[PDB]
Amino acid sequence: GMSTQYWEEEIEIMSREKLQELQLQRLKKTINIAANSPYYKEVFSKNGITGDSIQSLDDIRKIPFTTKSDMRANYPFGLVAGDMKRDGVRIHSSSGTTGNPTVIVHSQHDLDSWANLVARCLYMVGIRKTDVFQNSSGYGMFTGGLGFQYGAERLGCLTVPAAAGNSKRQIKFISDFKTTALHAIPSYAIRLAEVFQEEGIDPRETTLKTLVIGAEPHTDEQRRKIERMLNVKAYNSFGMTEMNGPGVAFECQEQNGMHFWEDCYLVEIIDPETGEPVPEGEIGELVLTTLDREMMPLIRYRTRDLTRILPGKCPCGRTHLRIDRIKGRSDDMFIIKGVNIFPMQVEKILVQFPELGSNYLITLETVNNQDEMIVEVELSDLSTDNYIELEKIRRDIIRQLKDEILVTPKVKLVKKGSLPQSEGKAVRVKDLRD
Amino acid sequence: TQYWEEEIEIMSREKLQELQLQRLKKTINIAANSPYYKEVFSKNGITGDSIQSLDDIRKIPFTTKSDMRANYPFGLVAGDMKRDGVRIHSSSTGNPTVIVHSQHDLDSWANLVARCLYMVGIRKTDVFQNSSGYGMFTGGLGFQYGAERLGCLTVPAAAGNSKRQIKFISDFKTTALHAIPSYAIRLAEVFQEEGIDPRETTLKTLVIGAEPHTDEQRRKIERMLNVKAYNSFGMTEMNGPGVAFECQEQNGMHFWEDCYLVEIIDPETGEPVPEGEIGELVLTTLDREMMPLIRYRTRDLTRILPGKCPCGRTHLRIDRIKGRSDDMFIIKGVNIFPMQVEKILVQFPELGSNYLITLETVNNQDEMIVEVELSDLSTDNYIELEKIRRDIIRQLKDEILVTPKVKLVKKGSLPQSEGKAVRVKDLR
Numbered sequence: 062g063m064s065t066q067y068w069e070e071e072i073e074i075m076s077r078e079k080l081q082e083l084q085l086q087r088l089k090k091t092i093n094i095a096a097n098s099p100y101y102k103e104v105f106s107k108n109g110i111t112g113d114s115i116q117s118l119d120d121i122r123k124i125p126f127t128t129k130s131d132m133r134a135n136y137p138f139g140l141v142a143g144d145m146k147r148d149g150v151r152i153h154s155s156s157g158t159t160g161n162p163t164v165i166v167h168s169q170h171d172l173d174s175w176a177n178l179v180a181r182c183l184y185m186v187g188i189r190k191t192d193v194f195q196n197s198s199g200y201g202m203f204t205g206g207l208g209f210q211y212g213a214e215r216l217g218c219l220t221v222p223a224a225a226g227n228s229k230r231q232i233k234f235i236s237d238f239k240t241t242a243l244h245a246i247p248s249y250a251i252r253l254a255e256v257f258q259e260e261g262i263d264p265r266e267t268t269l270k271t272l273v274i275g276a277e278p279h280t281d282e283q284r285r286k287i288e289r290m291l292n293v294k295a296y297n298s299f300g301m302t303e304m305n306g307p308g309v310a311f312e313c314q315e316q317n318g319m320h321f322w323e324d325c326y327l328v329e330i331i332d333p334e335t336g337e338p339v340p341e342g343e344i345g346e347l348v349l350t351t352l353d354r355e356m357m358p359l360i361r362y363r364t365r366d367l368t369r370i371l372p373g374k375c376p377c378g379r380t381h382l383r384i385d386r387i388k389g390r391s392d393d394m395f396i397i398k399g400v401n402i403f404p405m406q407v408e409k410i411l412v413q414f415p416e417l418g419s420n421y422l423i424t425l426e427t428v429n430n431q432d433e434m435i436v437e438v439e440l441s442d443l444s445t446d447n448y449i450e451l452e453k454i455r456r457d458i459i460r461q462l463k464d465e466i467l468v469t470p471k472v473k474l475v476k477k478g479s480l481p482q483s484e485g486k487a488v489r490v491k492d493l494r495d
Numbered sequence: 496t497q498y499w500e501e502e503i504e505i506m507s508r509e510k511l512q513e514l515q516l517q518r519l520k521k522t523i524n525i526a527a528n529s530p531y532y533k534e535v536f537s538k539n540g541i542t543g544d545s546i547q548s549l550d551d552i553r554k555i556p557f558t559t560k561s562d563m564r565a566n567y568p569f570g571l572v573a574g575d576m577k578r579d580g581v582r583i584h585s586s587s588t589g590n591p592t593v594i595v596h597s598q599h600d601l602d603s604w605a606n607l608v609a610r611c612l613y614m615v616g617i618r619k620t621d622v623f624q625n626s627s628g629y630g631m632f633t634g635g636l637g638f639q640y641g642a643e644r645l646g647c648l649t650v651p652a653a654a655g656n657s658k659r660q661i662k663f664i665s666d667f668k669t670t671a672l673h674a675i676p677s678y679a680i681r682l683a684e685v686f687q688e689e690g691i692d693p694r695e696t697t698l699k700t701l702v703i704g705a706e707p708h709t710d711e712q713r714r715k716i717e718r719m720l721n722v723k724a725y726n727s728f729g730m731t732e733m734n735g736p737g738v739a740f741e742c743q744e745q746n747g748m749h750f751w752e753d754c755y756l757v758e759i760i761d762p763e764t765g766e767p768v769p770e771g772e773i774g775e776l777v778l779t780t781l782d783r784e785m786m787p788l789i790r791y792r793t794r795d796l797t798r799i800l801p802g803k804c805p806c807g808r809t810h811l812r813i814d815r816i817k818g819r820s821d822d823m824f825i826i827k828g829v830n831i832f833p834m835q836v837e838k839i840l841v842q843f844p845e846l847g848s849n850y851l852i853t854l855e856t857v858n859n860q861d862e863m864i865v866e867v868e869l870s871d872l873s874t875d876n877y878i879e880l881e882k883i884r885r886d887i888i889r890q891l892k893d894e895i896l897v898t899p900k901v902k903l904v905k906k907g908s909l910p911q912s913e914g915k916a917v918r919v920k921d922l923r
């Protein structure tokens with residue numbers, strides 16, 4: 062607190078009263094912009110939302126929630142409010158070809174606001190322009206790639222856009238370029254420490270000092286295990302494509318709850334049953350409204366993430382609220398290797414193969430500290446194929462699943478009737494991870 | 496014509512040489528701070544007064560790939576990397592080359608890419624899709640920063656997943672696409688597989704590079720997708736994309752002489768070739784500060800196309816890159832380039848674009864086999880296709896001065912590489 066350094070001091074230690082004043086000003090601006098989108102223009106017309114409906118921050122509960130289903134219904138540009146042809150500079154899309162994915166469109170302002178938030182996060186945990194920042198996140202459509210790339214360049218780091226995979230190349234970059242800061246998912250940070258030992262390098266004696274980990278749920282003990290393996294300080298990083306990507310919520314150097322940047326997001330913790338705010342400090346669904354987005358703002362978006370607001374002031378001096386770890390979700394979505402997957406994406410691929418039966422089972426396991434996804438599917442006794450032909454089909458199933466869910470799964474063709482008789486519900490994901 | 500930077504793109508040759516000399520002296524003074532060029536300049540008596548004319552650059556020795564491997568990773572870094580270094584890129588072997596950029600270097604690079612896209616008619620109203628690999632490879636971030644700088648609605652699709660590439664083009668109404676020539680053909684084939692006419696999409700402009708390709712292969716891509724395709728040159732050492740680029744005349748690639756000093760040197764003598772002859776492309780960065788490169792031997796073989804261009808731009812044009820020095824192979828003591836084989840295969844419409852040259856040793860003698868896929872448009876029978884196969888062997892024996900074995904294979908039988916297509920497989 063007495064010796065804490067801030068990227069934007071005036072905003073990061075802003076009084077709660079002036080912070081709420083800033084939220085209300087940006088909330089009115091966001092509602093007036095979103096009114097230009099075809100989607101929110103209909104929502105505001107149906108629910109009588111005018112430019113005078115929002116007079117306080119509590120007036121936001123007048124607006125209905127925006128769901129993933131509504132965004133799929135208005136795919137691809139139903140929620141675009143700005144001039145996409147003149148001001149639109151980027152699209153970020155979620156995985157899939159069997160269904161309508163999620164699309165977020167950004168203007169140059171939106172990219173700058175997003176890069177500033179990521180720079181604010183990196184600076185908060187002690188990362189400076191003198192640091193060598195390596196990003197092991199996937200690039201392309203994944204917001205983790207370009208998100209940290211623009212943020213680290215904005216801070217002034219010597220960036221190493223390593224991208225995903227190739228552990229031996231990740232270790233080569235750290236050794237040759239003297240990397241000090243690394244962005245990786247918790248499970249891959251353990252893999253890199255393992256590969257360091259395989260190549261005869263002490264993972265505790267590298268140039269690494271700071272680690273940024275997120276994208277998937279992990280315990281505080283898992284993080285402390287990563288800190289001991291690599292002799293580093295690891296910080297929890299939260300974000301999602303709908304909210305830009307990285308830079309949404311981030312731990313401070315106290316490593317106790319993730320500070321949510323309330324100047325760019327309005328945070329609500331909602332009871333998934335009633336749809337009403339939970340008692341202060343209880344676990345509920347995270348519902349978010351963008352406050353600095355102009356091309357495609359999102360109002361009261363149901364993340365389906367479950368968390369709580371941690372009570373008490375933080376010793377770092379920052380007044381922005383802190384959320385607890387995200388330990389689960391209120392929908393059927395699962396995360397493997399940091400990638401979000403829906404079970405229907407797997408089913409929509411399997412049904413295309415007449416050699417397969419309708420009964421399938423997706424099992425998630427931890428092997429050698431790395432996450433593995435196994436897809437068991439029964440064979441239809443209609444299959445008039447031998448071993449060589451069925452094995453060629455199995456490889457095609459792996460290929461079509463890899464293209465759809467963006468992770469390589471293990472496909473096992475099992476005998477008809479071998480898989481256990483389900484309760485008759487769509488619950489077909491058996492997670493066996495700790 | 497419409498220009499991104501009119502004052503520079505149609506600048507008089509006299510003022511363009513004046514600009515080159517000013518930036519050449521600056522580059523030499525900056526590079527003198529690097530451990531590598533500090534030794535090179537001291538050994539060769541290169542001072543701040545050695546360069547008085549653009550011809551005085553021939554006082555400085557060449558920088559090779561071997562020199563960069565020897566000084567890997569930061570032996571040629573001239574600026575303050577800890578303070579001002581904002582990115583490291585790696586080329587696509589042994590230890591890959593490393594180029595370190597400052598914020599100035601990234602801005603100069605992004606500006607050159609936006610200048611290129613604007614030259615071929617791409618505007619902020621276009622939807623730009625980049626199918627280049629994203630990460631250490633300069634094609635990803637290089638075209639991303641350029642297209643955003645111009646103001647395009649960018650689609651960072653990255654490499655692979657053809658079904659997803661086609662979905663983005665259909666749903667986001669993509670108008671401009673960056674792809675390697677071989678992948679542009681793959682996308683057109685996948686369009687047909689998914690029941691979409693590849694000639695009836697929102698695509699208007701294509702940017703193709705990385706792979707050496709013939710003009711006829713480019714015209715084939717233009718007919719498949721009903722687009723205008725433009726040749727894009729670049730390399731990690733020279734930033735990446737935005738180095739050289741065709742104009743709307745599609746006749747030679749304009750080299751941006753405000754950021755690069757171009758030399759065509761004879762690999763034997765080490766002297767400049769007679770004006771317009773084929774030699775090794777030797778390049779010097781003019782607007783790089785963190786890690787400038789002086790007289791770098793690219794290993795690329797090309798020539799400077801003579802005459803001014805009808806587009807009005809005064810920047811010189813290079814011909815297509817016939818091939819790299821490492822791409823060349825030796826069979827029966829005869830030097831042969833893979834592009835010599837491709838230039839003959841493309842003039843047969845019965846053949847596909849996918850081919851593979853395999854080199855083997857049979858009975859202590861070297862043998863050269865050329866596998867080439869048949870196009871689905873071939874309505875010819877056995878006797879007619881065999882007459883074509885004999886004509887292919889004949890025109891090849893006359894071109895490469897060696898008799899090869901030509902085998903017409905089924906469409907899709909030859910392997911497709913993830914990145915650049917592999918045209919030569921040496922098994923000796």
Ligand SMILES: Nc1ncnc2c1ncn2[C@@H]1O[C@H](COP(=O)(O)OP(=O)(O)O)[C@@H](O)[C@H]1O
Nearest residue numbers: 204275276277278298299300301302387399401
């Ligand atoms: N730090 C984190 N801890 C737990 N879950 C996280 C964390 N960061 C992200 N997630 C999960 O990932 C989701 C965001 O996924 P996504 O939009 O695909 O972005 P990304 O490319 O980073 O995975 C969140 O809604 C949440 O469920």
Ligand SMILES: Nc1ncnc2c1ncn2[C@@H]1O[C@H](COP(=O)(O)OP(=O)(O)O)[C@@H](O)[C@H]1O
Nearest residue numbers: 586587632704705706707727728729730731816
């Ligand atoms: N337009 C082009 N036509 C032919 N060859 C090209 C072209 N662009 C690049 N190349 C080749 O690729 C080399 C650069 O490769 P590299 O630095 O690894 O970049 P990249 O990631 O795009 O492959 C050049 O030296 C040249 O041999």
Ligand SMILES: [K+]
Nearest residue numbers: 190218219580
């Ligand atoms: K730096």
Ligand SMILES: [K+]
Nearest residue numbers: 276399400401
């Ligand atoms: K995730």
Ligand SMILES: [K+]
Nearest residue numbers: 146619647648
């Ligand atoms: K645009």
Ligand SMILES: [Zn+2]
Nearest residue numbers: 313375377379
């Ligand atoms: Zn704090």
Ligand SMILES: [Zn+2]
Nearest residue numbers: 742804806808
């Ligand atoms: Zn021209």
